[PDB]
Design a protein around this ligand. Structure first.
Ligand SMILES: [Fe+3]
Ligand SMILES: [Fe+3]
Ligand SMILES: [Fe+3]
Ligand SMILES: [Fe+3]
Ligand SMILES: [Fe+3]
Ligand SMILES: [Fe+3]
Ligand SMILES: [Fe+3]
Ligand SMILES: [Fe+3]
Ligand SMILES: [Fe+3]
Ligand SMILES: [Fe+3]
Ligand SMILES: [Fe+3]
Ligand SMILES: [Fe+3]
Ligand SMILES: [Fe+3]
Ligand SMILES: [Fe+3]
Ligand SMILES: [Fe+3]
Ligand SMILES: [Mg+2]
Ligand SMILES: [Mg+2]
Ligand SMILES: [Mg+2]
Ligand SMILES: [Mg+2]
Ligand SMILES: [Mg+2]
Ligand SMILES: [Mg+2]
Ligand SMILES: [Mg+2]
Ligand SMILES: [Mg+2]
Ligand SMILES: [Mg+2]
Ligand SMILES: [Mg+2]
Ligand SMILES: [Mg+2]
Ligand code: NA
Ligand code: NA
Ligand code: NA
Lengths: 175, 175, 175, 175, 175, 175, 180, 180, 175, 175, 175
């Protein structure tokens, strides 16, 4: 074994002591778990979405998943850079995630999207707290990275909010 | 002051006398004002569109705005090339525009789109008259430029017409 | 006249005797006729689609048509490579096609899509039989090409199936 | 039936009344039919061309077909934009076409090319009349679009004319 | 009316309550108004710039305008994301702007540039205050977005400062 | 619930009855589970790899993960296309996977790589059986897709085999 | 054994643990793949030869076609060679070995007119085409679907070029006695 | 005064009217930025040195990494220098000035083995990394959010490369005594 | 006048005295005149080429002309860099050219090509002498530039030689 | 036969007499033979390289082979341009090559690389002599081309030299 | 130490003995020192340039610096390839440079540019001598590389010469 899960050694290269590093790592690993479950659920909805606006949603969800996957990669690599061990196995990621995950059945798109929006909100609030924690610790690179990811997550969260809004070009007439 | 608003000196480089130039400039500046209000309203709807088909409309409207902005740039620069002064300030553009502009409230997408379609029609009819005026004046470059813009405007006007058509994949069943 | 419609001479370059070649050509030409009518009907729906989700469908249908056109080109060229004569004129293509083609009236998008889905299924089933026929004849290049096209056709057929599914973001409320 | 073949309703979006629109639509649909038969014959020659200069002709014809297909798409969409119904089925396109189409046999390249050149000329002369008709009707976007297509068609028609010219690098000696 | 100008509902998706959201929205809308007047004035100078270094300035100003337009789009969309209504009409934008706008006459380039530099400074100082306001409110995505825009605006403001500096390659001799 | 996990309805669009479809779906879902655990373990090694050749391995592993992720997407979408429900949650994927997954500790690169190579072999052997199963069922598109993925997986499996081979440029002297 | 200099001996096939391919099955594919490799590389070199030497009224188009044909042949050879290596075998490498192991006929060092040159190449393609068809079946039968798939992917590109040459040699032309 | 030849004197900071930054506040950022610039440019030159000289079993990958690291360091320096200039200051320019003003240690002109070379560079990164963190706070405190943001943008790229070097120096390898 | 035709002042920037510079300039201007007549004749043949292989020749000649135009630009700019005055007007270029130019009639392609090949040979031999003259003068940049152009010119000269060779795919049979 | 191996006719197009041409051709053909054996051996090592740094070497060797293949193409075409016959068959190339070629067994990477480095040195020294021979003959295009290739060959030769140097990041500890 | 500054071992790979190699290395290292001081001074002027034409000069100087940096990289790597040690530290580079470097004050653009032009001339003359030295030593790759760099340096040197010429579009009137 080269490293033990749960341990945080910090980094000499990045001049980050283990105490300070572990504070960021704990926050980052928690985010990582949630972001990866989000990724998998976005993939699920991407694969299963059907209906009148399925292709646009399919494409949106695919892009949302890609973004979530990139954020997770950033998070995981920052955890590793800070001398920590990023959650890796699917089982570990879900167990460590605090957000709710749909069961294996497929729900209609409005329900599916609403579930995803709930996951985003949770991650969004957490990321805001984590960027402050990082800035407070003087880890400006982590803080900056978190904000860079936060803006992409909020964009997708906002997109879902608009998909669920009570407007449409459809009329009873065209119906 | 280098040039006075309302004045048209023509161009020696383009061999266009002030009399003939002013005829085109008057037409071009009128179009410019309408095209820029269109641009701003398309931006408005682009920003605010919500609902089941919001992302596709968001993207369409963004592209429509970009097109409107490019047409305005063409118009403004042609006015300047002909020795005239293109309407510049937001206040001047709206005051000089003849099309109707929504008030600051946000309306549902069908209403919003319908308002935009009305603006396009006005600009479309005007541009047709202006291309003839230009050809008649022997200003073939202006005439050509107007047609180049006309085709892009009509494409977007047509798109909105189709968005508002009484058809949909939606059924009472899926509802 | 350089070649007579209906004749299959095989190919010395491809070491394919006329007997074996004609078996593939008969299958390929039948597919070609159906694929080209599909192409034209997809173009029709691409041009005419209107409504709340018309732009996304317009784009999808345009891409579906392009794919159908490329498959036909592949089919036609393989027929020619095997010493045969690919169906060419519009009249010949339709007459040789076994799938149903809408009359010249324009139907609502759900009806239009459903008609196209029926054409895909027919072509899909036929292509599956033709790839086996080709493999059995030892014409692995034709077999491979058919599968390459089959996967693109099935993707579009699947897309239409999802467009017609009983789900939507629309609610009676937004309506 | 959402729309009936032969009917032209004009467009409110494009401020084009049905009377004026129908004049353009009749012209556009006639061109569409001819352009699509041209497309299919160009495809035929593209597939079948053989001989000393076949690869260059194969590529040229492929490009000529793509151009013809884009012109047809433009024509068809303009017809639809003007409230009309573009000819769609292969059978309808050929029946509505006024140009001559080769029978299903394959002819030598000089004969093939000559037949295509005849189709181009017909379309070229018609398009010139149609652009005037459109300008006269004040439909400058249609007029402009026709000229844009006319220039591409004339380029390919000219190419064929040069391919058939009485010159060559070949000498009796190299023969 | 789907939304009323001046109202801010916050966002459930982004877990941003209306109280906090309105604080950011008020700041963002003020910036939007100023950024859009800047955009229009930059366009004005872009169109009208003449003289020995006009082409380089024309290109610079065009790029400055594009940047201002993208910043405005960011601002407007963030306002919308936070449940607010972004200023849209030209008239509203100018009325809501606090920066000074040139009258419709065209001034020499040094005067024009100096006026623009004054607009930038105002926006720059405001954006700095607004990023702090956002960070204080814990809206790190807005804060980050503001800084991203601030750096681009300061770059262009700096460019103008250098264009106006008292140095040149010109000598009395070359004169 | 729009669809229940474990159910397979086949597809009318793809002319695939539920009986035949379920046979492919069972195979595809099993592969999906294994491919996604592979993806996550490849990501793990990508993040954690250290040492003399870490950067090249980091890049290789990143690419291997991306490939595994695309294969999973293909598999999942084919399952969905065939009327089935692709395993989605991290917990479900791992539970349904038959390959071994490392515990959360980080091992040296040779051990890590060896574990991954074992996962590839399992997936490789399974995919070979599944392509035959698909061809036998006459589902040539699934068969083809499996082979397309098989070749990419075997390439990466082979890469790992070479990374572990007993050769190196290193000498006791340079040591 | 532990002391041979060679890391691998030409002719040996060890299969692959990574690809779960035993030496017995692997050697069957390797024998087929190496034979194809030899022929494909001689084809590559002859296509290069004709690419370099083609002259006349339609030389530039042929020059470009032949260059592309050579590139394709080179890529197919690379695929074949790497698959051989992946299956635990040793791909024919030296020019001398490639030609010796090739079964197709190669022109002598003189330069022939383009019709003759092209005809010779078409003969090489046919040989490779027929062999590749047999080899894809052999691979599918052995359950080596990745090799089978790769062979078909290459087969389609080779047949396209073989077909092109066939058309270049067809009895048609825009030339007339008049233009002559 | 009106007659000095120099357009600007090294060490002076006039702030900026365009950026609404007074000289007092500007000079605080400029002092920080110029110090970073000096260190970043010596880093750049040492990374170039190692890029040029790296040899051995993994030299090509290191050559490419070091080249990219140098490019990144050069871009950061350009950003720093231009921000200094934007704030009315004079960025250190000459090679002699840059090194003299740098606080990090620079290798002498001899070439050392890659592990030693890399270790020296890692030490330079840490120094710059710690300094940049302090400087971003200084800038935020001064309300110069554009400088603060720019510093973080550069900090993340520098930390990435510092981290890469750390991994290159880690005690792991695919090499075994057997392959040796 | 800013500079007088025929005068060569050398360059202080390039440390090239007028004496040495004038030797290169005389050589470069002679080449420039010939290269530009070549350019214009290549354009002529590009425009006029007809026959069985016209399209390939049209494209080749177009590329040959572009190459000749770039070489002339290089030559002219080097002349200017060395303090000289490059021949500019069409009349001056032809008068200063030593190669033969066809009269205004259009000749068959073999004759046209043969004339061009003669021009290339002349330029090729001259360029070889000029590169030696430059190297001897120690003007290695001019020498290098000449060789860079020489290789492109020889490539095109060689192409024409091959177009004129006594070989063809054509047979009396296909004839 | 159109041309006999061993004969050199020079070129009228390139103004190169057979006497002078044959001197360059003899040099070029010798280089061609060596460069192509190098190409094939680089391919061999590219295919077979295994071990801790195999992927980087695999990629390097692939690129080295591509470079060698391009140099051979240049050489062969220059030989043909000068009226000669480039060595073509694999058998001829190896027989005409003076460098040593490994037997068909696969050696460890250090041995393989060392063998390649020996081939490069031979080609490098020869190319230096050949560029002088060409310059002396006044064939500056051949001379220039040789140097262009020489620089790429020396770069790869140098790369191999560095791969074989006595340094590594590996330590007895990591071992 | 792995290598000692000042030592030149030549290269076995490149068949370059230490004696001959050291002659090139001494020349190359001298050029490297000058080119890097040039690079840094070009950067200085790039950063500091202000005034009426600053943006164009800013861009030019940036490009000039990039070019100087690439030339230095080439030089340094060639030194290393020949078994030498390229000057590395800023202090060493300046100490080893023979060109004059401005003190740390910022001068007006004309003065700055004139200083740079002086540096170019020095490097230009030196590079000419060094290419001859290399050719004489039979090191054609170094010779070729030097000329490739010489042409880019002379282009920039020439650009500065033109920036300083006594011409301008400015008139006393516009002033
Ligand atoms: Fe990553
Ligand atoms: Fe503009
Ligand atoms: Fe085709
Ligand atoms: Fe279309
Ligand atoms: Fe146009
Ligand atoms: Fe937007
Ligand atoms: Fe950023
Ligand atoms: Fe997907
Ligand atoms: Fe494929
Ligand atoms: Fe390869
Ligand atoms: Fe810069
Ligand atoms: Fe130029
Ligand atoms: Fe070059
Ligand atoms: Fe070639
Ligand atoms: Fe480098
Ligand atoms: Mg670590
Ligand atoms: Mg003007
Ligand atoms: Mg045929
Ligand atoms: Mg309609
Ligand atoms: Mg909203
Ligand atoms: Mg300044
Ligand atoms: Mg479904
Ligand atoms: Mg192996
Ligand atoms: Mg001059
Ligand atoms: Mg020849
Ligand atoms: Mg060395
Ligand atoms: Na909808
Ligand atoms: Na011909
Ligand atoms: Na290693």
């Amino acid at each position: 074994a080269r490293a033990t899960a749960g341990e945080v050694e910090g980094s000499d290269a990045l001049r980050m002591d283990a105490d300070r590093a572990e504070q960021c790592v704990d926050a980052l690993n928690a985010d990582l778990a949630n972001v990866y479950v989000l990724y998998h659920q976005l993939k699920k909805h991407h694969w299963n979405v059907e209906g009148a606006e399925f292709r646009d949603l399919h494409l949106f969800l695919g892009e949302a998943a890609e973004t979530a996957e990139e954020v997770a990669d950033e998070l995981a690599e920052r955890v590793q850079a800070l001398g920590g061990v990023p959650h890796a196995s699917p089982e570990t990621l879900q167990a460590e995630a605090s957000v709710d995950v749909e069961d294996e059945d497929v729900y209609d798109i409005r329900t599916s999207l609403a579930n995803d929006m709930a996951i985003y909100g949770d991650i969004i609030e957490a990321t805001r707290e984590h960027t402050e924690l990082a800035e407070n610790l003087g880890d400006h690179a982590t803080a900056h990275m978190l904000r860079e990811g936060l803006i992409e997550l909020e964009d997708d969260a906002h997109h879902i909010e608009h998909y669920l809004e009570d407007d449409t070009l459809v009329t009873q007439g065209a119906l």
